[PDB]
GROMACS .gro file of C-alpha atoms in nm:
model
  261
    1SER     CA    1  15.651   4.172   3.918
    2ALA     CA    2  15.279   4.246   3.896
    3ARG     CA    3  15.341   4.616   3.962
    4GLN     CA    4  15.543   4.647   3.641
    5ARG     CA    5  15.231   4.507   3.472
    6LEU     CA    6  15.004   4.773   3.620
    7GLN     CA    7  15.263   5.037   3.530
    8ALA     CA    8  15.255   4.907   3.173
    9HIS     CA    9  14.879   4.970   3.172
   10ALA     CA   10  14.923   5.322   3.310
   11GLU     CA   11  15.161   5.406   3.026
   12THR     CA   12  14.896   5.280   2.785
   13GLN     CA   13  14.633   5.511   2.936
   14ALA     CA   14  14.876   5.804   2.952
   15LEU     CA   15  14.945   5.790   2.578
   16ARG     CA   16  14.570   5.768   2.515
   17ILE     CA   17  14.492   6.079   2.721
   18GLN     CA   18  14.788   6.258   2.561
   19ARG     CA   19  14.651   6.176   2.215
   20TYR     CA   20  14.325   6.338   2.324
   21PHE     CA   21  14.494   6.663   2.428
   22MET     CA   22  14.751   6.676   2.147
   23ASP     CA   23  14.480   6.629   1.883
   24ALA     CA   24  14.298   6.929   2.029
   25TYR     CA   25  14.628   7.119   2.037
   26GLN     CA   26  14.706   7.040   1.673
   27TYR     CA   27  14.347   7.128   1.581
   28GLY     CA   28  14.379   7.465   1.755
   29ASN     CA   29  14.702   7.549   1.572
   30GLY     CA   30  14.518   7.477   1.248
   31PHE     CA   31  14.259   7.742   1.332
   32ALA     CA   32  14.530   7.979   1.455
   33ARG     CA   33  14.706   7.942   1.120
   34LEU     CA   34  14.377   8.029   0.949
   35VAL     CA   35  14.335   8.334   1.173
   36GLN     CA   36  14.686   8.458   1.097
   37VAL     CA   37  14.646   8.414   0.721
   38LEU     CA   38  14.309   8.589   0.733
   39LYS     CA   39  14.470   8.878   0.921
   40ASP     CA   40  14.787   8.883   0.708
   41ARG     CA   41  14.586   8.915   0.385
   42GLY     CA   42  14.343   9.179   0.512
   43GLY     CA   43  14.049   9.257   0.288
   44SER     CA   44  13.705   9.372   0.395
   45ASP     CA   45  13.450   9.180   0.606
   46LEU     CA   46  13.734   9.019   0.803
   47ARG     CA   47  13.573   9.029   1.148
   48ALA     CA   48  13.254   8.864   1.021
   49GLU     CA   49  13.464   8.602   0.842
   50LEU     CA   50  13.672   8.532   1.153
   51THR     CA   51  13.354   8.493   1.360
   52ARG     CA   52  13.209   8.252   1.103
   53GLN     CA   53  13.533   8.052   1.078
   54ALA     CA   54  13.558   8.037   1.458
   55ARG     CA   55  13.209   7.886   1.479
   56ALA     CA   56  13.280   7.634   1.203
   57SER     CA   57  13.608   7.542   1.374
   58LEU     CA   58  13.436   7.480   1.708
   59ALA     CA   59  13.145   7.304   1.537
   60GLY     CA   60  13.405   7.081   1.370
   61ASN     CA   61  13.529   6.949   1.706
   62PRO     CA   62  13.265   6.807   1.942
   63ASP     CA   63  13.541   6.728   2.195
   64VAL     CA   64  13.578   7.101   2.270
   65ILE     CA   65  13.330   7.305   2.475
   66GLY     CA   66  13.464   7.653   2.398
   67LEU     CA   67  13.676   7.856   2.158
   68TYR     CA   68  13.796   8.207   2.237
   69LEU     CA   69  13.985   8.445   2.008
   70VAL     CA   70  14.097   8.770   2.173
   71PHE     CA   71  14.309   9.027   1.992
   72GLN     CA   72  14.494   9.315   2.153
   73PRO     CA   73  14.334   9.662   2.119
   74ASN     CA   74  14.345   9.758   1.749
   75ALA     CA   75  14.586   9.469   1.684
   76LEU     CA   76  14.352   9.290   1.443
   77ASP     CA   77  14.278   9.566   1.191
   78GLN     CA   78  14.352   9.902   1.364
   79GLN     CA   79  13.979   9.978   1.335
   80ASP     CA   80  13.838   9.889   1.677
   81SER     CA   81  13.649  10.220   1.685
   82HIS     CA   82  13.452  10.100   1.381
   83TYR     CA   83  13.303   9.801   1.567
   84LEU     CA   84  13.190   9.931   1.907
   85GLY     CA   85  12.939   9.690   2.058
   86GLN     CA   86  12.889   9.477   1.745
   87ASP     CA   87  12.893   9.142   1.922
   88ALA     CA   88  12.768   8.963   1.610
   89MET     CA   89  13.114   9.035   1.462
   90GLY     CA   90  13.303   8.930   1.777
   91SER     CA   91  13.368   9.288   1.892
   92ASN     CA   92  13.294   9.393   2.250
   93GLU     CA   93  13.183   9.734   2.382
   94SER     CA   94  13.526   9.885   2.304
   95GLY     CA   95  13.543   9.749   1.949
   96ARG     CA   96  13.805   9.505   2.053
   97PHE     CA   97  13.777   9.169   1.883
   98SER     CA   98  13.709   8.949   2.188
   99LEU     CA   99  13.502   8.656   2.063
  100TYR     CA  100  13.401   8.343   2.254
  101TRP     CA  101  13.206   8.056   2.098
  102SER     CA  102  13.053   7.813   2.349
  103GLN     CA  103  12.956   7.451   2.282
  104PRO     CA  104  12.782   7.318   2.595
  105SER     CA  105  12.672   7.016   2.389
  106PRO     CA  106  12.787   6.908   2.041
  107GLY     CA  107  12.611   7.114   1.774
  108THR     CA  108  12.485   7.387   2.010
  109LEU     CA  109  12.702   7.696   1.964
  110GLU     CA  110  12.652   8.025   2.149
  111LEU     CA  111  12.806   8.357   2.043
  112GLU     CA  112  12.952   8.598   2.298
  113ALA     CA  113  13.164   8.913   2.282
  114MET     CA  114  13.356   8.920   2.609
  115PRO     CA  115  13.363   9.264   2.775
  116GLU     CA  116  13.683   9.435   2.885
  117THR     CA  117  13.586   9.369   3.248
  118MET     CA  118  13.605   8.995   3.183
  119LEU     CA  119  13.935   9.028   2.995
  120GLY     CA  120  14.084   9.226   3.284
  121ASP     CA  121  13.941   9.039   3.583
  122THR     CA  122  14.261   8.994   3.783
  123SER     CA  123  14.077   8.859   4.088
  124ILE     CA  124  14.179   8.511   4.200
  125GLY     CA  125  13.945   8.224   4.118
  126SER     CA  126  13.886   7.876   4.252
  127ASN     CA  127  14.224   7.725   4.159
  128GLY     CA  128  14.433   8.005   4.310
  129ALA     CA  129  14.515   8.153   3.968
  130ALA     CA  130  14.374   8.477   3.834
  131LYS     CA  131  14.039   8.448   3.659
  132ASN     CA  132  14.183   8.589   3.334
  133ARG     CA  133  14.492   8.367   3.326
  134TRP     CA  134  14.330   8.188   3.031
  135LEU     CA  135  14.414   8.504   2.833
  136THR     CA  136  14.706   8.665   3.020
  137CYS     CA  137  14.930   8.355   3.039
  138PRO     CA  138  15.006   8.334   2.664
  139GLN     CA  139  15.023   8.714   2.635
  140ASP     CA  140  15.277   8.754   2.917
  141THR     CA  141  15.491   8.454   2.816
  142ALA     CA  142  15.457   8.453   2.432
  143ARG     CA  143  15.414   8.074   2.452
  144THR     CA  144  15.130   7.824   2.472
  145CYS     CA  145  14.975   7.750   2.811
  146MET     CA  146  14.801   7.443   2.953
  147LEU     CA  147  14.577   7.598   3.215
  148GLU     CA  148  14.490   7.435   3.544
  149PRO     CA  149  14.126   7.329   3.592
  150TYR     CA  150  13.914   7.634   3.671
  151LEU     CA  151  13.541   7.698   3.699
  152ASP     CA  152  13.435   7.949   3.433
  153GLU     CA  153  13.112   8.146   3.389
  154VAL     CA  154  12.946   8.092   3.050
  155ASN     CA  155  12.603   8.256   3.008
  156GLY     CA  156  12.509   8.208   3.372
  157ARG     CA  157  12.650   7.853   3.385
  158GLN     CA  158  12.939   7.742   3.605
  159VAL     CA  159  13.155   7.510   3.393
  160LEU     CA  160  13.464   7.329   3.523
  161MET     CA  161  13.724   7.340   3.248
  162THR     CA  162  14.087   7.352   3.143
  163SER     CA  163  14.215   7.548   2.844
  164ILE     CA  164  14.479   7.524   2.571
  165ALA     CA  165  14.581   7.885   2.510
  166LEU     CA  166  14.781   7.955   2.193
  167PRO     CA  167  14.944   8.296   2.138
  168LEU     CA  168  14.930   8.462   1.797
  169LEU     CA  169  15.271   8.619   1.740
  170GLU     CA  170  15.396   8.869   1.482
  171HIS     CA  171  15.776   8.906   1.499
  172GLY     CA  172  15.773   8.769   1.853
  173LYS     CA  173  15.497   9.011   1.959
  174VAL     CA  174  15.173   8.857   2.087
  175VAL     CA  175  14.899   9.027   1.884
  176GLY     CA  176  14.622   8.795   2.007
  177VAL     CA  177  14.531   8.468   2.174
  178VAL     CA  178  14.349   8.159   2.045
  179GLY     CA  179  14.209   7.923   2.305
  180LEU     CA  180  14.039   7.583   2.323
  181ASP     CA  181  13.830   7.502   2.630
  182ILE     CA  182  13.808   7.136   2.736
  183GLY     CA  183  13.542   7.063   2.994
  184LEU     CA  184  13.634   6.836   3.283
  185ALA     CA  185  13.317   6.635   3.214
  186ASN     CA  186  13.488   6.508   2.899
  187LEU     CA  187  13.799   6.428   3.104
  188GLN     CA  188  13.578   6.252   3.360
  189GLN     CA  189  13.441   6.034   3.079
  190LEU     CA  190  13.800   5.947   2.982
  191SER     CA  191  13.869   5.826   3.336
  192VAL     CA  192  13.545   5.626   3.332
  193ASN     CA  193  13.628   5.481   2.990
  194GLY     CA  194  13.975   5.401   3.122
  195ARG     CA  195  13.825   5.222   3.422
  196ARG     CA  196  13.625   4.991   3.204
  197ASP     CA  197  13.929   4.896   3.000
  198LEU     CA  198  14.140   4.841   3.314
  199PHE     CA  199  14.114   4.461   3.353
  200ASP     CA  200  13.730   4.486   3.333
  201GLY     CA  201  13.657   4.759   3.584
  202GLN     CA  202  13.778   4.635   3.923
  203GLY     CA  203  13.997   4.942   3.979
  204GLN     CA  204  13.986   5.320   3.944
  205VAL     CA  205  14.141   5.572   3.705
  206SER     CA  206  14.234   5.932   3.785
  207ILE     CA  207  14.393   6.214   3.585
  208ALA     CA  208  14.616   6.451   3.783
  209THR     CA  209  14.730   6.789   3.653
  210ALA     CA  210  15.075   6.948   3.682
  211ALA     CA  211  14.969   7.114   4.010
  212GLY     CA  212  14.826   6.794   4.159
  213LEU     CA  213  14.463   6.884   4.087
  214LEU     CA  214  14.217   6.615   3.977
  215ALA     CA  215  14.104   6.673   3.619
  216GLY     CA  216  13.940   6.329   3.623
  217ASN     CA  217  13.856   6.064   3.885
  218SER     CA  218  13.639   5.763   3.801
  219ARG     CA  219  13.549   5.704   4.167
  220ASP     CA  220  13.394   6.033   4.285
  221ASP     CA  221  13.256   6.308   4.062
  222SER     CA  222  13.245   6.583   4.327
  223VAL     CA  223  13.626   6.604   4.367
  224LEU     CA  224  13.713   6.733   4.020
  225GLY     CA  225  13.936   7.042   4.023
  226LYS     CA  226  14.076   6.988   4.374
  227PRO     CA  227  14.410   6.845   4.495
  228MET     CA  228  14.438   6.469   4.452
  229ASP     CA  229  14.453   6.246   4.760
  230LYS     CA  230  14.821   6.246   4.856
  231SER     CA  231  14.755   5.945   5.079
  232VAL     CA  232  14.635   5.606   4.953
  233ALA     CA  233  14.409   5.335   5.090
  234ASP     CA  234  14.537   4.977   5.117
  235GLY     CA  235  14.437   4.674   4.915
  236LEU     CA  236  14.491   4.887   4.603
  237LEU     CA  237  14.831   4.982   4.460
  238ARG     CA  238  14.855   5.331   4.311
  239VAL     CA  239  15.072   5.362   4.000
  240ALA     CA  240  15.116   5.672   3.787
  241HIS     CA  241  15.254   5.750   3.443
  242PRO     CA  242  15.309   6.105   3.316
  243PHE     CA  243  15.198   6.258   2.989
  244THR     CA  244  15.228   6.600   2.828
  245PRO     CA  245  14.902   6.758   2.705
  246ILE     CA  246  15.077   7.019   2.488
  247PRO     CA  247  15.443   7.040   2.383
  248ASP     CA  248  15.691   7.180   2.637
  249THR     CA  249  15.473   7.202   2.948
  250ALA     CA  250  15.479   7.045   3.292
  251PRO     CA  251  15.343   6.689   3.258
  252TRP     CA  252  15.009   6.569   3.384
  253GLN     CA  253  14.974   6.206   3.491
  254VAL     CA  254  14.729   5.916   3.476
  255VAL     CA  255  14.671   5.755   3.815
  256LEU     CA  256  14.569   5.389   3.829
  257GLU     CA  257  14.436   5.209   4.137
  258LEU     CA  258  14.360   4.838   4.145
  259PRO     CA  259  14.323   4.548   4.391
  260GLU     CA  260  14.625   4.319   4.395
  261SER     CA  261  14.438   4.005   4.285
   0.00000   0.00000   0.00000
Protein backbone atom coordinates (compact mmCIF):
# COMPACT_ATOMS: atom_id res chain seq x y z
CA SER A 1 0.00 0.00 0.00
CA ALA A 2 1.32 3.41 1.02
CA ARG A 3 3.66 1.82 3.57
CA GLN A 4 5.54 -0.02 0.82
CA ARG A 5 6.02 3.45 -0.69
CA LEU A 6 7.54 4.87 2.49
CA GLN A 7 9.69 1.75 2.80
CA ALA A 8 10.91 2.38 -0.75
CA HIS A 9 12.02 5.84 0.37
CA ALA A 10 13.81 4.42 3.43
CA GLU A 11 15.81 2.08 1.20
CA THR A 12 16.77 5.11 -0.88
CA GLN A 13 18.05 6.96 2.19
CA ALA A 14 19.81 3.86 3.53
CA LEU A 15 21.88 3.45 0.37
CA ARG A 16 22.73 7.16 0.51
CA ILE A 17 23.98 6.99 4.10
CA GLN A 18 25.86 3.77 3.28
CA ARG A 19 27.58 5.50 0.37
CA TYR A 20 28.71 8.17 2.84
CA PHE A 21 30.28 5.64 5.21
CA MET A 22 31.69 3.30 2.56
CA ASP A 23 33.40 6.19 0.76
CA ALA A 24 35.12 7.09 4.03
CA TYR A 25 35.98 3.41 4.53
CA GLN A 26 37.48 3.08 1.05
CA TYR A 27 39.33 6.37 1.57
CA GLY A 28 40.79 5.09 4.84
CA ASN A 29 42.03 1.87 3.24
CA GLY A 30 43.78 4.02 0.65
CA PHE A 31 45.73 5.79 3.38
CA ALA A 32 46.34 2.49 5.18
CA ARG A 33 47.83 1.09 1.97
CA LEU A 34 50.10 4.14 1.81
CA VAL A 35 51.15 3.63 5.45
CA GLN A 36 51.98 -0.03 4.85
CA VAL A 37 54.02 0.69 1.72
CA LEU A 38 55.87 3.49 3.53
CA LYS A 39 56.66 1.08 6.36
CA ASP A 40 57.48 -1.87 4.07
CA ARG A 41 60.06 0.18 2.13
CA GLY A 42 61.71 1.77 5.17
CA GLY A 43 64.18 4.55 4.47
CA SER A 44 64.98 7.50 6.68
CA ASP A 45 62.63 10.33 7.73
CA LEU A 46 59.70 7.88 7.77
CA ARG A 47 57.92 9.21 10.87
CA ALA A 48 57.97 12.79 9.55
CA GLU A 49 56.70 11.54 6.18
CA LEU A 50 53.90 9.53 7.80
CA THR A 51 52.85 12.57 9.84
CA ARG A 52 52.83 14.74 6.71
CA GLN A 53 50.90 12.15 4.69
CA ALA A 54 48.40 11.71 7.53
CA ARG A 55 47.69 15.45 7.53
CA ALA A 56 47.33 15.58 3.75
CA SER A 57 45.02 12.56 3.88
CA LEU A 58 42.78 14.17 6.49
CA ALA A 59 42.96 17.54 4.71
CA GLY A 60 41.84 15.70 1.56
CA ASN A 61 38.55 14.64 3.18
CA PRO A 62 36.44 17.42 4.75
CA ASP A 63 33.81 14.81 5.70
CA VAL A 64 36.16 13.44 8.40
CA ILE A 65 36.88 15.20 11.71
CA GLY A 66 39.81 13.05 12.87
CA LEU A 67 42.50 10.63 11.73
CA TYR A 68 44.51 8.52 14.16
CA LEU A 69 47.44 6.22 13.36
CA VAL A 70 48.74 4.21 16.33
CA PHE A 71 51.47 1.61 15.98
CA GLN A 72 52.39 -1.01 18.55
CA PRO A 73 55.54 -0.34 20.63
CA ASN A 74 58.54 -0.47 18.26
CA ALA A 75 56.31 -2.02 15.58
CA LEU A 76 56.81 0.85 13.11
CA ASP A 77 60.61 1.00 12.90
CA GLN A 78 62.01 -0.68 16.06
CA GLN A 79 63.40 2.74 17.05
CA ASP A 80 60.84 4.13 19.50
CA SER A 81 63.65 5.09 21.89
CA HIS A 82 64.94 7.49 19.20
CA TYR A 83 61.74 9.58 19.22
CA LEU A 84 60.83 10.13 22.88
CA GLY A 85 58.46 13.08 23.17
CA GLN A 86 58.84 14.30 19.57
CA ASP A 87 55.16 15.02 18.99
CA ALA A 88 55.91 16.86 15.75
CA MET A 89 56.80 13.43 14.30
CA GLY A 90 53.74 11.69 15.77
CA SER A 91 55.68 10.07 18.63
CA ASN A 92 54.40 10.31 22.21
CA GLU A 93 56.40 10.42 25.47
CA SER A 94 57.47 6.77 25.03
CA GLY A 95 58.58 7.17 21.42
CA ARG A 96 55.62 5.21 20.27
CA PHE A 97 54.13 6.44 17.04
CA SER A 98 50.67 7.48 18.29
CA LEU A 99 49.53 10.30 16.01
CA TYR A 100 46.11 11.97 15.89
CA TRP A 101 45.19 14.68 13.39
CA SER A 102 42.03 16.63 14.26
CA GLN A 103 39.82 18.54 11.80
CA PRO A 104 37.16 20.38 13.84
CA SER A 105 36.29 22.34 10.68
CA PRO A 106 37.41 21.71 7.09
CA GLY A 107 40.92 23.03 6.55
CA THR A 108 41.78 23.41 10.26
CA LEU A 109 44.09 20.55 11.26
CA GLU A 110 45.56 20.08 14.74
CA LEU A 111 48.52 17.80 15.53
CA GLU A 112 48.56 15.62 18.64
CA ALA A 113 50.72 12.77 19.93
CA MET A 114 48.44 10.71 22.14
CA PRO A 115 50.06 9.65 25.44
CA GLU A 116 50.16 6.07 26.66
CA THR A 117 47.58 6.95 29.32
CA MET A 118 45.07 7.77 26.58
CA LEU A 119 45.92 4.61 24.63
CA GLY A 120 45.43 2.50 27.75
CA ASP A 121 42.38 4.18 29.30
CA THR A 122 40.27 1.09 29.95
CA SER A 123 37.66 3.03 31.93
CA ILE A 124 34.12 2.88 30.57
CA GLY A 125 32.80 5.92 28.73
CA SER A 126 29.40 7.31 27.86
CA ASN A 127 28.24 4.49 25.56
CA GLY A 128 29.12 1.66 27.96
CA ALA A 129 32.23 0.69 25.97
CA ALA A 130 35.79 1.30 27.10
CA LYS A 131 37.20 4.71 26.24
CA ASN A 132 40.05 3.15 24.21
CA ARG A 133 37.87 0.74 22.22
CA TRP A 134 38.58 2.95 19.19
CA LEU A 135 42.09 1.44 19.32
CA THR A 136 41.69 -1.90 21.12
CA CYS A 137 38.82 -3.27 19.00
CA PRO A 138 40.84 -3.73 15.78
CA GLN A 139 43.91 -4.85 17.75
CA ASP A 140 42.06 -7.57 19.67
CA THR A 141 40.01 -8.81 16.68
CA ALA A 142 42.42 -8.25 13.73
CA ARG A 143 39.46 -6.87 11.77
CA THR A 144 37.89 -3.50 11.04
CA CYS A 145 35.48 -2.02 13.59
CA MET A 146 32.54 0.36 13.26
CA LEU A 147 32.50 1.97 16.68
CA GLU A 148 29.36 3.03 18.50
CA PRO A 149 28.85 6.79 19.00
CA TYR A 150 31.06 8.00 21.83
CA LEU A 151 32.02 11.41 23.19
CA ASP A 152 35.76 11.95 22.78
CA GLU A 153 38.08 14.59 24.24
CA VAL A 154 40.04 16.53 21.61
CA ASN A 155 42.14 19.45 22.93
CA GLY A 156 39.68 20.25 25.71
CA ARG A 157 36.63 19.80 23.44
CA GLN A 158 33.94 17.17 23.93
CA VAL A 159 33.09 15.81 20.48
CA LEU A 160 30.39 13.22 19.81
CA MET A 161 31.73 10.84 17.18
CA THR A 162 31.87 7.37 15.68
CA SER A 163 35.00 5.81 14.22
CA ILE A 164 36.05 3.49 11.40
CA ALA A 165 39.04 1.61 12.81
CA LEU A 166 41.20 -0.31 10.33
CA PRO A 167 43.89 -2.72 11.56
CA LEU A 168 47.29 -2.81 9.87
CA LEU A 169 48.28 -6.47 9.65
CA GLU A 170 51.59 -8.16 8.83
CA HIS A 171 51.13 -11.93 8.40
CA GLY A 172 47.90 -11.76 10.38
CA LYS A 173 49.57 -9.78 13.19
CA VAL A 174 48.14 -6.34 13.96
CA VAL A 175 51.15 -4.02 13.93
CA GLY A 176 49.08 -0.83 14.10
CA VAL A 177 45.68 0.80 13.69
CA VAL A 178 44.40 3.43 11.24
CA GLY A 179 41.21 5.23 12.19
CA LEU A 180 38.77 7.73 10.69
CA ASP A 181 36.61 9.78 13.05
CA ILE A 182 33.18 10.86 11.79
CA GLY A 183 31.47 13.46 13.94
CA LEU A 184 27.79 12.99 14.69
CA ALA A 185 27.20 16.60 13.63
CA ASN A 186 27.87 15.46 10.06
CA LEU A 187 25.47 12.55 10.57
CA GLN A 188 22.91 14.98 12.00
CA GLN A 189 23.19 17.03 8.80
CA LEU A 190 22.52 13.85 6.80
CA SER A 191 19.29 13.28 8.73
CA VAL A 192 18.31 16.92 8.19
CA ASN A 193 19.17 16.70 4.48
CA GLY A 194 17.16 13.48 4.34
CA ARG A 195 14.19 15.20 5.96
CA ARG A 196 14.08 17.86 3.31
CA ASP A 197 14.10 15.29 0.53
CA LEU A 198 11.39 13.21 2.24
CA PHE A 199 8.27 14.42 0.39
CA ASP A 200 9.22 18.07 1.16
CA GLY A 201 9.90 17.93 4.88
CA GLN A 202 6.66 16.87 6.57
CA GLY A 203 8.31 13.94 8.36
CA GLN A 204 11.45 13.10 10.30
CA VAL A 205 14.61 11.09 9.59
CA SER A 206 16.73 9.22 12.13
CA ILE A 207 19.87 7.08 11.88
CA ALA A 208 20.11 4.20 14.36
CA THR A 209 23.31 2.31 15.09
CA ALA A 210 23.78 -1.44 15.54
CA ALA A 211 23.22 -1.04 19.30
CA GLY A 212 20.07 1.08 18.89
CA LEU A 213 21.82 4.39 19.59
CA LEU A 214 20.83 7.51 17.66
CA ALA A 215 23.68 8.67 15.42
CA GLY A 216 21.27 11.14 13.78
CA ASN A 217 17.77 12.46 14.45
CA SER A 218 16.32 15.39 12.48
CA ARG A 219 13.76 16.19 15.20
CA ASP A 220 15.84 16.76 18.36
CA ASP A 221 19.56 17.53 18.50
CA SER A 222 20.06 16.76 22.21
CA VAL A 223 19.33 13.01 21.87
CA LEU A 224 22.32 12.04 19.72
CA GLY A 225 24.31 9.11 21.09
CA LYS A 226 21.49 7.68 23.25
CA PRO A 227 19.09 4.76 22.68
CA MET A 228 16.42 5.47 20.09
CA ASP A 229 12.78 5.72 21.17
CA LYS A 230 11.57 2.11 21.18
CA SER A 231 7.99 3.39 21.30
CA VAL A 232 6.36 5.49 18.58
CA ALA A 233 3.80 8.29 18.53
CA ASP A 234 0.67 7.96 16.39
CA GLY A 235 -0.25 9.83 13.24
CA LEU A 236 3.22 8.94 11.93
CA LEU A 237 4.26 5.51 10.66
CA ARG A 238 7.83 4.46 11.48
CA VAL A 239 9.62 2.48 8.78
CA ALA A 240 13.24 1.38 8.82
CA HIS A 241 15.73 0.05 6.30
CA PRO A 242 19.16 -1.32 7.26
CA PHE A 243 22.54 -0.44 5.81
CA THR A 244 26.11 -1.52 6.49
CA PRO A 245 28.63 1.30 7.10
CA ILE A 246 31.69 -0.93 6.57
CA PRO A 247 31.87 -4.46 5.12
CA ASP A 248 30.98 -7.36 7.43
CA THR A 249 29.59 -5.50 10.44
CA ALA A 250 26.25 -5.35 12.22
CA PRO A 251 23.95 -3.11 10.15
CA TRP A 252 22.81 0.35 11.12
CA GLN A 253 19.42 1.56 9.91
CA VAL A 254 17.69 4.67 8.60
CA VAL A 255 14.45 5.44 10.44
CA LEU A 256 11.72 7.36 8.62
CA GLU A 257 8.66 8.92 10.26
CA LEU A 258 5.88 10.60 8.30
CA PRO A 259 2.20 11.56 8.62
CA GLU A 260 -0.10 9.23 6.70
CA SER A 261 -1.52 11.91 4.37
